[PDB]
Design a protein around this ligand. Structure first.
Ligand SMILES: C[C@H]1N[C@H](CN[C@@H](CO)c2ccccc2)[C@@H](O)[C@H]1O
Ligand SMILES: *[C@@H]1O[C@H](CO)[C@@H](O)[C@H](O)[C@H]1NC(C)=O
Ligand SMILES: [Zn+2]
Length: 1014
């Protein structure tokens, strides 16, 4: 295994180093506004060395943006695809590329058999070629790597089944900035080439000057280069026709034949296209070939890529004709005029890359190596696209909840083969497709119109209901004696209980377990653990009495804590934000212990008085002018007091001190250690009154943030043996710090209300001497080093925080893990900050046509980990990566993949069992089974089950941490007959495994295996 910590890779371009050296001046470069006047030697190309030009027709189809997916399919995409089939069938030399498989599958299934056969023929003969082949062209900033793989697999599995092809070239022309997580996943899924477009205009200028726009993109920790993927970066401002034929858009626009008038389009540079004739073909070819030779100067081979397309193009039959016939006249002239030394033709993306590598093998070019990312993107001036790292935060959090429910539903139902009548495959396919659709670059990014955001929410709600159904039918089958098991596949045997989604204060969705001497004395509950190691975690349920005790299924008592159910209200009469307690529902909390990828059953029983093994929390309400707070049967009366500083400690854990406003002030790790200053603060950013305005994509603050005026907020303190917390009602945010014995959990109920043109940020202030360095993650896969640059504006120093961020000095580290992707930065030494929500009245000129005024309450969750790191073996100063400690990685897993909770729905569960999975191996803490999925239906003689195994890399800081068991996924199901290593999409077998044993992977590696069973 390669050492991902101690060896700094040697690459030609390292993006953090490039950023430190570049000036980023925005000067007028001439007709190529952000470049320079390109010059070329006409003698470079000649009879023995011609320029080969591939014009590649394409149509960018967004799966929702200004219209919903179905509205665009009906108004535009079904006509584009129907006319592509007719035109390619009738014109054998015409070509076309297609990226979004969600639309293609929606079209194909509605076609008659004759047309399905015609479509398969133009794919088999190479005229219509699929690029990437994912369900969508995903966002690369907020998306989790697990969902980028899920949508890639959904589209490529459909393509293999119905079109018999698997793309090896990727096309990503519209995501707002680019992530190395893409070549990581693509290279492990059979790809050989990829293309990107939206990178900072200063970066395109710098790389073009050095002819470094084509490069071997490897991971930042990869010393050997085995992760490398050939990448082509487009050079200009847009992927549209005016910015794809060459450097001068006033010239290129004249070669977009849809812009002469009858289609309602024109050229903003004021010179229109003109129909090619025998009297003007020579002068038009002279202008076009000059643009092509200028573009060719920016690259190393004699093969040139010329995309020809735009949004929802190639719709009308007349449009197909106007572009094809005019280009065919240009090619016939150009290719017959020897003085140009050019051979031009329509081509596909794979054809371009195959010709580039033929040139490389002929020794005509060598390519540079590169590592790093391409965030944060700016397309012009100071217009940095960091706003979408936060826009529509409710749906960003919903993405992570659904991510976990799809994993748990596929894993729980994979253990058995299911009758078709159970509709398991049907519900899982719907769930995978709705979550895959939301990975689109106007979905999770929060950049679609209001009614489109509603469509994505409705689709994800249906996906959550599908997951719940599959999960609860699976738990009933896994924990019921086989000869008693009697399923009704439409029945609800268990209901899921989720404490953090939609969350307290967002939706009253949780069911109370109703017990009573005159109705039901007890209730079974079951916990599932999707991770491959034994896990303990506190769990809570709402119950109708405080006198409840817990037992495991051997009837052993389990220690429990009961607390009140508190809800916060904006009292429009007293003009205060304060908590009200329930006098009939209570929370019971206890530690559940669950096997690796397994289930554990517990029982809740009522008694007439306080049970021996259940304790009750105390509650203290701090505010001036208090009024009584009755709690029905709860045995401890609420106490009151004026605001004051307070300190709390649960278990042997850290001791936390809070200000009289209920915000963290310091953390003391041990009995003896110092009280380290760690302060939470809420602030607000505004919008500029003149110039460009912030919107769904852009963050254009009117200066540094100003503190939110807090007034004298109401603070609630609950102190218990197993769990304690401090909660405070601040303007727009109910802020809560929860302690269970380790790093605290932070929850913010954020309601920006009617505060227009405001962005609310949560900042941490410390005295850690971090200087200008901080770390953020990429897609929940890896941590990359960031350097704050004062030569760039505040918004350029904002980066995506898809799952975590940290700052450190020689001795101390502060890590903030998140349960949802948000935007953030470190704007000064010792600080971390992350945006909570943003409400904007204006549109930001990127096509959305509205502001963001549809905010709704959202419950954000986090873990805050303060640690000493002086003993950890860390990368050297020049290494571009960082790595988490064991405690920080487990804290991230507690947020993204918590235990699942099920409440038995009827009065008596006949045949109930106590545990499932006690014999599953408990794997080392850095290893995860990211995906477990049965790949065959019940009628297959040979069953197949696929697994994706990921190992992260944790710092060695002196903790022995030993004895774990080897995890061989191929022997998790009985009667294994074969074990194969496959691509990550499970579509190609790469290795037949000896002894049917699947080896574990190396740190930072991801592998896929399929076991076959007789
Ligand atoms: C974020 C947005 N980027 C693309 C914008 N496309 C351009 C035309 O090339 C456009 C289309 C419509 C209005 C303004 C600008 C869209 O595909 C969408 O995903
Ligand atoms: C699918 O493609 C393969 C390419 O290896 C070909 O050999 C096979 O016959 C194809 N099957 C069809 C035509 O469905
Ligand atoms: Zn788009």
């Amino acid at each position: 295994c390669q050492d991902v910590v101690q060896d700094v890779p040697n690459v030609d371009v390292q993006m953090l180093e490039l950023y430190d050296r570049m000036s980023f001046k925005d000067i007028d470069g001439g007709v190529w506004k952000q470049g320079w006047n390109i010059k070329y030697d006409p003698l470079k190309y000649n009879a023995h060395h011609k320029l080969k030009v591939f014009v590649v027709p394409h149509s960018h189809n967004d799966p929702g943006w200004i219209q919903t997916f179905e509205e665009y399919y009906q108004h535009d995409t079904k006509h584009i695809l129907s006319n592509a089939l007719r035109h390619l069938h009738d014109n054998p030399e015409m070509k076309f590329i297609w990226a979004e498989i969600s639309y293609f599958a929606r079209f194909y299934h509605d076609l008659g058999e004759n047309k399905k056969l015609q479509m398969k023929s133009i794919v088999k003969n190479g005229q219509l070629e699929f690029v990437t082949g994912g369900w969508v062209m995903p966002d690369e900033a907020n998306s989790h790597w697990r969902n980028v793989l899920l949508q890639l697999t959904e589209g490529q599995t459909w393509l293999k089944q119905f079109m018999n092809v698997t793309p090896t070239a990727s096309w990503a022309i519209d995501p707002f900035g680019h992530s190395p997580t893409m070549p990581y996943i693509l290279q492990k899924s059979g790809f050989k080439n990829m293309l990107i477009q939206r990178t900072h205009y200063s970066v395109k200028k710098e790389l073009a000057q050095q002819r470094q726009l084509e490069f071997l993109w490897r991971q930042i920790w990869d010393n050997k280069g085995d992760t490398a993927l050939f990448t082509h970066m487009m050079p200009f401002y847009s992927y549209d026709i005016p910015h794809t034929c060459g450097p001068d858009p006033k010239v290129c626009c004249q070669f977009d034949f849809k812009r002469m008038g009858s289609f309602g389009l024109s050229c903003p540079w004021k010179v229109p296209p003109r129909t090619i004739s025998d009297q003007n073909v020579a002068a038009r070819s002279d202008l076009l070939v000059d643009q092509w030779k200028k573009k060719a100067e920016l690259y190393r081979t004699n093969v040139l890529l010329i995309p020809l397309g735009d949004d929802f193009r190639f719709k009308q039959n007349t449009e197909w004709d106007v572009q094809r016939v005019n280009y065919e006249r240009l090619f016939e002239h150009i290719n017959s005029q020897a003085h140009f030394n050019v051979q031009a033709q329509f081509g596909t993306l794979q054809e371009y890359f195959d010709a580039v590598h033929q040139a490389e093998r002929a020794g005509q070019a060598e390519f540079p190596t590169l590592s790093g990312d391409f965030f944060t993107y700016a397309d012009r001036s100071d217009n940095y696209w960091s706003g979408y790292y936060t826009s529509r935060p409710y749906h960003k959090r919903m993405d992570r909840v659904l991510m976990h429910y799809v994993r748990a539903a596929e894993m729980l139902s994979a253990w058995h083969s299911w009758d078709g009548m159970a509709r398991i495959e049907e519900r899982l396919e719907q769930a995978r497709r709705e979550l895959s659709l939301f990975q689109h670059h106007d979905g999770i990014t929060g950049t679609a119109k209001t009614h489109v955001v509603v469509d994505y929410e409705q689709r994800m709600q249906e996906a959550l209901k599908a997951c719940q159904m599959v999960m609860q039918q699976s738990v009933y089958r896994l924990l019921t004696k086989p000869s008693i098991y009697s399923p009704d596949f439409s029945f609800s045997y268990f209901t899921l209980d989720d404490s953090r989604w939609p969350g307290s204060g967002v939706e009253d969705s949780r069911t109370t377990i109703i017990l009573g001497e005159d109705i039901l004395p007890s209730k079974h509950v079951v916990m599932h653990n999707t991770l491959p190691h034994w896990r303990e975690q506190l769990v809570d349920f709402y119950v109708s009495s405080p006198f409840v005790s817990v037992t495991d299924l051997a009837n052993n008592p389990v220690e429990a804590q009961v607390s009140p159910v508190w809800s916060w209200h904006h009292d429009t009469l007293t003009k205060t934000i304060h908590p009200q307690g329930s006098t009939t529902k209570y929370r019971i909390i206890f530690k559940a212990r669950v096997p690796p990828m397994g289930l554990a059953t517990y029982v809740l029983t009522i008694s007439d008085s306080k049970p021996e093994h259940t304790s009750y929390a105390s509650n203290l309400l701090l505010r001036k002018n208090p009024t009584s707070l009755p709690l029905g049967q709860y045995p401890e009366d609420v106490k009151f007091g004026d605001p004051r500083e307070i300190s709390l400690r649960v278990g042997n854990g850290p001791t936390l001190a809070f200000s009289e406003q209920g915000l963290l002030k310091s953390i003391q790790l041990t009995q003896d250690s110092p009280h380290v200053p760690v302060h939470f603060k809420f602030l607000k950013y505004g919008v500029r009154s003149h110039g460009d305005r912030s919107g769904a994509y852009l963050f254009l603050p009117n200066g540094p943030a100003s503190p939110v005026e807090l007034g004298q907020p109401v603070v609630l303190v609950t102190k218990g043996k197993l769990e304690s917390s401090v909660s405070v009602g601040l303007p727009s945010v109910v802020h809560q710090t929860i302690m269970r014995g380790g790093a605290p959990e932070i929850r913010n109920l954020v309601d920006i209300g009617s505060l227009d043109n405001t962005e609310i940020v949560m900042r941490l202030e410390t005295h850690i001497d971090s200087g200008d360095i901080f770390y953020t993650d990429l897609n929940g896969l890896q941590f990359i080093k960031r350097r704050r640059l004062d030569k760039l504006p505040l918004q350029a120093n904002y980066y995506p925080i898809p799952s975590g961020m940290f700052i450190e000095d020689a001795n101390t580290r502060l890590t903030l893990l998140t349960g949802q992707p948000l935007g953030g930065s470190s704007l000064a030494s010792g600080e971390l900050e992350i945006m909570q929500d943003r409400r904007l009245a204006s549109d930001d000129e990127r096509g959305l046509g509205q502001g963001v005024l549809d905010n709704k309450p959202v419950l954000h969750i986090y873990r805050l980990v303060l640690e000493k790191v002086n003993n950890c073996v860390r990368p050297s100063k020049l290494h571009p990566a960082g790595y988490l400690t064991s405690a920080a990685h487990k804290a991230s897993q507690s947020l993204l993949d918590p235990l699942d909770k099920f409440i038995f729905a009827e009065n008596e569960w006949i045949g109930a069992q106590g545990q499932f999975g006690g014999d599953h191996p408990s794997a080392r803490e850095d290893l995860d089974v990211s995906v477990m999925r049965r790949l065959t239906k019940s009628s297959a003689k040979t069953q197949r089950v696929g697994y994706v195994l990921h190992r992260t890399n944790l710092m060695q800081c002196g903790t022995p941490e030993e004895h774990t068991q080897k995890l061989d996924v191929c022997h998790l199901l009985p009667n294994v007959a074969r074990c194969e290593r496959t691509t990550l999409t499970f579509l190609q077998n790469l290795e037949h495994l000896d002894g049917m044993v699947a080896p574990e992977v190396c740190p930072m590696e991801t592998a896929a295996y399929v076991s076959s069973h007789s």
